[PDB]
Coordinates of C-alpha atoms and ligand atoms in Angstrom, one line a residue:
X192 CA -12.4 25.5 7.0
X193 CA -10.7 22.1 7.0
X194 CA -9.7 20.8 3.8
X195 CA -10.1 17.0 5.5
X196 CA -12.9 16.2 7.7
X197 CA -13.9 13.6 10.0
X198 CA -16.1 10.3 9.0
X199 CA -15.9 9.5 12.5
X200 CA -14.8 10.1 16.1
X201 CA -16.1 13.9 15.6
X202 CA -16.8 13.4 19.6
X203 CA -12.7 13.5 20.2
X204 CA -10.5 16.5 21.7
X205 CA -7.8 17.6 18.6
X206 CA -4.5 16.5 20.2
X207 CA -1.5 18.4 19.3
X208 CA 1.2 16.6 17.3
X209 CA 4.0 17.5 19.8
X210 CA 1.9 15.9 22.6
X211 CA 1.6 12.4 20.5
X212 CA 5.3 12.0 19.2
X213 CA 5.9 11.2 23.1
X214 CA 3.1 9.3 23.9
X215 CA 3.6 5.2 23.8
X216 CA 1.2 3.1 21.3
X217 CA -1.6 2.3 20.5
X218 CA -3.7 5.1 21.1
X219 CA -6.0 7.3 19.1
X220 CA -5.9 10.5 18.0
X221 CA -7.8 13.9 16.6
X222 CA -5.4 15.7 14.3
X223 CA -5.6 19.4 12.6
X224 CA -2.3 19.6 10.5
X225 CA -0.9 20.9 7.5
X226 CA 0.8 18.3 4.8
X227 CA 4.2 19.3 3.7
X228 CA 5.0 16.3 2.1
X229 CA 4.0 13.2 0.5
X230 CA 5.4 9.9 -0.9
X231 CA 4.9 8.7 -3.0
X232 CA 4.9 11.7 -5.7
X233 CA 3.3 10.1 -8.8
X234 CA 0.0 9.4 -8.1
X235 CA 0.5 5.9 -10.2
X236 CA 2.7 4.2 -8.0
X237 CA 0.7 4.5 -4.9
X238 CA -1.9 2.0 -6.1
X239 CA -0.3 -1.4 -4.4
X240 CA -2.3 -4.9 -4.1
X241 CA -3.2 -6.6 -0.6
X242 CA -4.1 -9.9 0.0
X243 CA -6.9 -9.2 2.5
X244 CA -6.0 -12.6 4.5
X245 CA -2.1 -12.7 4.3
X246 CA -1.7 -8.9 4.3
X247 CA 1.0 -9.2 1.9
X248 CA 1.7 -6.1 -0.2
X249 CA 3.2 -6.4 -3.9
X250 CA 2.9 -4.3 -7.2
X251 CA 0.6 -3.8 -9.9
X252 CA 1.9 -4.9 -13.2
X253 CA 2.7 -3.2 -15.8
X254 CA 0.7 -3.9 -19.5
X255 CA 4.1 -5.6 -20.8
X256 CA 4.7 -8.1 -18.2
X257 CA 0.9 -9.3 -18.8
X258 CA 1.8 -9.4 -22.6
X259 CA 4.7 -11.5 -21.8
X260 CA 3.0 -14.1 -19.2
X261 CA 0.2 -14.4 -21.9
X262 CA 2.7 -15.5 -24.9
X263 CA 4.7 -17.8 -22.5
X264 CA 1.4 -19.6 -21.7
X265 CA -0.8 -19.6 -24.3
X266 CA -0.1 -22.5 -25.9
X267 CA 0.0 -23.4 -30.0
X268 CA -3.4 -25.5 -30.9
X269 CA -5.8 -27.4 -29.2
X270 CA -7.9 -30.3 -30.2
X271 CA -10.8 -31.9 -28.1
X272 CA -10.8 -28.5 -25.8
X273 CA -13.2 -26.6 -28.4
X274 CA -16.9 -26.5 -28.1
X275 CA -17.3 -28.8 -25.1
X276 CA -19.6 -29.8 -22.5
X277 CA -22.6 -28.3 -20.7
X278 CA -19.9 -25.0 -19.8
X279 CA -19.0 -23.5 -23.0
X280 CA -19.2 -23.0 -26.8
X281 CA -15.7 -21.9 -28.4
X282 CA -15.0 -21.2 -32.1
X283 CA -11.5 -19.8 -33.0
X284 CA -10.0 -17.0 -34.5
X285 CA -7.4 -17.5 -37.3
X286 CA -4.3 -14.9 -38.6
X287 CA -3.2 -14.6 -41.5
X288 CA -0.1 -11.8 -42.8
X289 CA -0.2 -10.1 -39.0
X290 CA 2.7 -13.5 -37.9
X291 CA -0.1 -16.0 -37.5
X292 CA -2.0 -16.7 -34.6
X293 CA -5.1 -18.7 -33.5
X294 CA -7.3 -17.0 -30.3
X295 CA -9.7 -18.7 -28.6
X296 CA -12.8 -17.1 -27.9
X297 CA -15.0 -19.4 -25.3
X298 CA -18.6 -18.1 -24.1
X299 CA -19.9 -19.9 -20.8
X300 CA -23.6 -20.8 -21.0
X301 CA -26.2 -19.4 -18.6
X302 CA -27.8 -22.6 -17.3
X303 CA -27.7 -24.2 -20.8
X304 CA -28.7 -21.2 -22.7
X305 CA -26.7 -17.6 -23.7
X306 CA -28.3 -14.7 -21.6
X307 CA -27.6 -11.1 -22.7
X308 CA -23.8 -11.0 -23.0
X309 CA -23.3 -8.3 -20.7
X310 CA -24.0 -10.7 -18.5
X311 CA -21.3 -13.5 -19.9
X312 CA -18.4 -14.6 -19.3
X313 CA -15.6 -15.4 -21.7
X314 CA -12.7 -17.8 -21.7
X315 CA -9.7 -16.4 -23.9
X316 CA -6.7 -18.7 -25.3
X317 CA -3.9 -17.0 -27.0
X318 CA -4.8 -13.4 -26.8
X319 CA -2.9 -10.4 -25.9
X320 CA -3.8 -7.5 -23.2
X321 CA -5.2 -4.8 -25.6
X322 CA -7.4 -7.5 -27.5
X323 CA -8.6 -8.7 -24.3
X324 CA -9.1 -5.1 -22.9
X325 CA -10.8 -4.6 -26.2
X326 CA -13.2 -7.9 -25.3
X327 CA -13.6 -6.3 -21.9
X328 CA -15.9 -3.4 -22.3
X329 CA -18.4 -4.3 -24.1
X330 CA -18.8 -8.3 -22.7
X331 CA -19.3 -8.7 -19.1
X332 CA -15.8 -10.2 -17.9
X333 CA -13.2 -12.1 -19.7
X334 CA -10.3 -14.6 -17.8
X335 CA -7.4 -15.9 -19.7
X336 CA -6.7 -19.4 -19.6
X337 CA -4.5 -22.0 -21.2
X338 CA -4.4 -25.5 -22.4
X339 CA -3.8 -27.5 -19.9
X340 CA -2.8 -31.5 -19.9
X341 CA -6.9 -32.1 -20.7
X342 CA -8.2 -29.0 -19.2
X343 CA -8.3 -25.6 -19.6
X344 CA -6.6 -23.9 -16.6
X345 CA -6.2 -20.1 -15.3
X346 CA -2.5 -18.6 -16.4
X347 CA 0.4 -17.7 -13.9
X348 CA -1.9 -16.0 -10.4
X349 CA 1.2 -12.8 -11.5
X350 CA -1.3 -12.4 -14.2
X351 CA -5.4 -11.5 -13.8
X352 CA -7.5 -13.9 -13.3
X353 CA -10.8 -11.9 -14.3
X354 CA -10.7 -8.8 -16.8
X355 CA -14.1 -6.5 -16.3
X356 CA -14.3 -3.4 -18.1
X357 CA -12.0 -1.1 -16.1
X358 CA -11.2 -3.3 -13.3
X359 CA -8.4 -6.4 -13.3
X360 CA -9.1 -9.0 -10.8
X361 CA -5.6 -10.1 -9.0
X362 CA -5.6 -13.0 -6.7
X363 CA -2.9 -14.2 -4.2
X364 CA -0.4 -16.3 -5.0
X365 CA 0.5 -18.8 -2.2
X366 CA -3.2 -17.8 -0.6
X367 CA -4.6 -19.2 -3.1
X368 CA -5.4 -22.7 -5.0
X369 CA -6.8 -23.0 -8.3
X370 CA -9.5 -25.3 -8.6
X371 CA -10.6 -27.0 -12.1
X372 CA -12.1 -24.6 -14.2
X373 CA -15.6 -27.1 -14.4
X374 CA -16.5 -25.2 -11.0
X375 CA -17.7 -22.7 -13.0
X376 CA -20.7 -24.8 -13.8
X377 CA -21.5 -24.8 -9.8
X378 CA -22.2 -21.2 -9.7
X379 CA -25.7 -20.0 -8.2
X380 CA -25.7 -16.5 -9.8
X381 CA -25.6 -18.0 -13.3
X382 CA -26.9 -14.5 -14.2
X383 CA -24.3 -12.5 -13.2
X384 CA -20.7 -13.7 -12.2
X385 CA -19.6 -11.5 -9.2
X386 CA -15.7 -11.4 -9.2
X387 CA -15.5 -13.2 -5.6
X388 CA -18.1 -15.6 -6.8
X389 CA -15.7 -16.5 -9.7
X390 CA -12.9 -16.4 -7.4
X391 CA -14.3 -18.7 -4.6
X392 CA -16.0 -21.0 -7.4
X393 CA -11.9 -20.9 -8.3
X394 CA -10.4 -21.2 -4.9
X395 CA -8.8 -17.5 -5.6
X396 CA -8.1 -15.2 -2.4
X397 CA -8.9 -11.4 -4.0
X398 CA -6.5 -8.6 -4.0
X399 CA -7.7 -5.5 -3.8
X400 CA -6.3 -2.3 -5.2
X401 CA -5.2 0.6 -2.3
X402 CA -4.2 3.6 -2.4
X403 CA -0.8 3.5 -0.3
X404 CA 0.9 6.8 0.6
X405 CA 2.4 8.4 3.4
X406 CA 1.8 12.2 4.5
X407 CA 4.2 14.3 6.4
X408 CA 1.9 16.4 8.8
X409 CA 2.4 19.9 10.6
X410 CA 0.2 21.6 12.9
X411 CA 2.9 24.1 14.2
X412 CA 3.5 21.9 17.6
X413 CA 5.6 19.2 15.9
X414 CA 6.0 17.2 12.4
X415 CA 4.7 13.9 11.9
X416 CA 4.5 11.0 9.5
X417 CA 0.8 9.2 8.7
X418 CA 0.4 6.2 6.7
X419 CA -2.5 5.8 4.4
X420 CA -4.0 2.7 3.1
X421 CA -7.4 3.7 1.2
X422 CA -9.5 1.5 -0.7
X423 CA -12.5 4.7 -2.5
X424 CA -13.5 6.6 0.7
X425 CA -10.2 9.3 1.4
X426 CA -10.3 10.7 -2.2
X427 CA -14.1 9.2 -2.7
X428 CA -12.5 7.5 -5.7
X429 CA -12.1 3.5 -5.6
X430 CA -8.5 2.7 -6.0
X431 CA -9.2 -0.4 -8.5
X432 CA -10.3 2.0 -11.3
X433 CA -7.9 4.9 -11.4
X434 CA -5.3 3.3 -13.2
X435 CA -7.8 2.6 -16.4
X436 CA -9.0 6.2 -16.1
X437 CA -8.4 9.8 -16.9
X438 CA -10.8 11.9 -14.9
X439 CA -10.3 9.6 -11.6
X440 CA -6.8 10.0 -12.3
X441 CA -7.0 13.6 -12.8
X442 CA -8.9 14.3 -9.7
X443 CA -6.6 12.5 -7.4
X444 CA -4.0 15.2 -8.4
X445 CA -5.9 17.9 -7.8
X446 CA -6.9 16.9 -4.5
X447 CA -3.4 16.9 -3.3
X448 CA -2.5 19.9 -4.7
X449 CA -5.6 21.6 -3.2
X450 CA -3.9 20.2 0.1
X451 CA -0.5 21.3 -0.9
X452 CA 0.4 23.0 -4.1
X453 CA 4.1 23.9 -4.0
X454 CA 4.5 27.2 -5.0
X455 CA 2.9 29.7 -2.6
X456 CA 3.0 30.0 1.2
X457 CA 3.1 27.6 4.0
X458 CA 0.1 29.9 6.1
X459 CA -1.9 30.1 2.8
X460 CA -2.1 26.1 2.7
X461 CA -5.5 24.4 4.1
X462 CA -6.1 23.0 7.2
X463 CA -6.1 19.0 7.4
X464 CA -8.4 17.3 9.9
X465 CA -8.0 13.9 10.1
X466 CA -8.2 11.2 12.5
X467 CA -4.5 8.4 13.4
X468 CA -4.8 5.1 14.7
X469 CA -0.8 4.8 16.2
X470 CA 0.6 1.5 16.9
X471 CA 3.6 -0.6 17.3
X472 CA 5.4 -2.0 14.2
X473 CA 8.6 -3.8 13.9
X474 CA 10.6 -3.4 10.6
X475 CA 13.4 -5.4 10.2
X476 CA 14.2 -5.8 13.9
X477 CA 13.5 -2.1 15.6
X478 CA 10.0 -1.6 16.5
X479 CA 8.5 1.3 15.4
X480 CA 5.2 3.7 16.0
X481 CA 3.3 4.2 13.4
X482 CA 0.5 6.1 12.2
X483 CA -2.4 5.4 10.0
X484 CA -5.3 7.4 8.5
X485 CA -8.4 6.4 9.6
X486 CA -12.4 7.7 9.2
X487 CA -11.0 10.7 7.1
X488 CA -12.0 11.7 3.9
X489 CA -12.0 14.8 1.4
X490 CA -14.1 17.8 2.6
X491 CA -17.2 19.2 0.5
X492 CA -16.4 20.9 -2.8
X493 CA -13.0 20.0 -3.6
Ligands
LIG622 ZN1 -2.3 -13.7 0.7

């Protein structure tokens, strides 16, 4: 059997890779191939982030460049912004013999009154990434800010703008525009923040994380190159969690060496049976076929 089968299109005729390398784009096609290749090899730096509006594609960042925006923005004391308003109530930490340091610790109020805290929201000022990641699994969802001129405001849009448990909330940059962080008070599901309610009550365009490779495919008729840009459904594990995990991150692995392990025979590897959407792409000026994965995913048992 297949290692790969079809989400979708199971109605098409298999088209052999020789006939489509001549064909012109866009078309669409039913594929039964075996993967050589792939890029990239780690299965860490295939997660990218894609503004879902601009369709810009950047890096995820690695724990020390957060560590670094966070000291460059947090900022030394504050005075009025502590325990304000109708949004927040904020009492400090203090350090003493670890260098000294004062983080700020702000819980946002459920329509005037605290609700069970894993649903509530937090408001750090001055923290670092493991204290925050720390914060992060047992409360709800914490954002870092900074003092601003006379109001708290979000950190660089480079860094997270909503830490919840194992998932980092990334917005665009240009996409988006932060709004004052009071619009938090104008937020219907007081219960429970949704990360694109925060981010709309923020003005914040969402990146999500994807799972960006590229497979070299060979049915025996011709070889050909397939893009892939999954967000859960190819491996059946969401791309915005791997990173933070071991077991997601260990399956991921085994799933492409169950397609190709390299090591044993080229006829002993498994059939792949996906489905490519080609089309027309121009690069820096050459335009260019190319070939994405779509309505495929992992067959039954591994
Ligand atoms: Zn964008």
């Amino acid at each position: 059997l297949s290692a790969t089968i079809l989400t979708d299109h199971q109605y098409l005729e298999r088209t052999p890779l020789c006939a489509i390398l001549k064909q012109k784009a866009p078309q669409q096609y039913r594929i039964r191939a075996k993967l050589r290749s792939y890029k990239p090899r780690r299965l860490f730096q295939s997660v990218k982030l894609h503004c879902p509006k601009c369709h810009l594609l950047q890096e995820v960042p690695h724990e020390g460049d957060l560590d670094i925006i966070f000291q460059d923005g947090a900022t030394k004391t504050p005075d009025v912004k502590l325990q304000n308003t109708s949004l927040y109530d904020s009492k400090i930490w203090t350090t003493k013999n670890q260098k000294g340091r004062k983080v700020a610790v702000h819980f946002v109020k459920n329509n005037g009154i605290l609700p069970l805290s894993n649903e509530c929201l937090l408001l750090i000022e001055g923290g670092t990434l493991s204290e925050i990641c720390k914060l992060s699994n047992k409360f709800n969802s914490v954002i870092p800010v900074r003092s601003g001129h006379e109001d708290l405001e979000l950190l660089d849009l480079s860094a997270p703008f909503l830490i919840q448990g194992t998932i980092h909330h990334y917005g665009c940059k240009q996409c988006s525009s932060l709004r004052s962080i009071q619009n938090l008070n104008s937020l219907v599901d007081k219960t429970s923040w949704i990360p694109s309610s925060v981010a709309e009550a923020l003005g914040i365009v969402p990146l999500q994380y994807v799972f960006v490779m590229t497979f070299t495919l060979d049915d025996g008729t011709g070889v050909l190159e397939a893009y892939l840009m999954d967000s859960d459904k190819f491996f059946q594990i969401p791309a915005s969690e791997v990173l933070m995990d071991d077991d997601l991150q260990k399956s991921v692995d085994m799933i492409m060496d169950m397609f190709c392990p390299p090591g044993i025979k080229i006829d002993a590897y498994p059939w792949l049976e996906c489905f490519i959407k080609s089309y027309n792409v121009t690069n820096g000026t050459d335009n260019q076929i190319c070939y994405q994965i779509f309505d495929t995913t992992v067959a039954e048992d591994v």
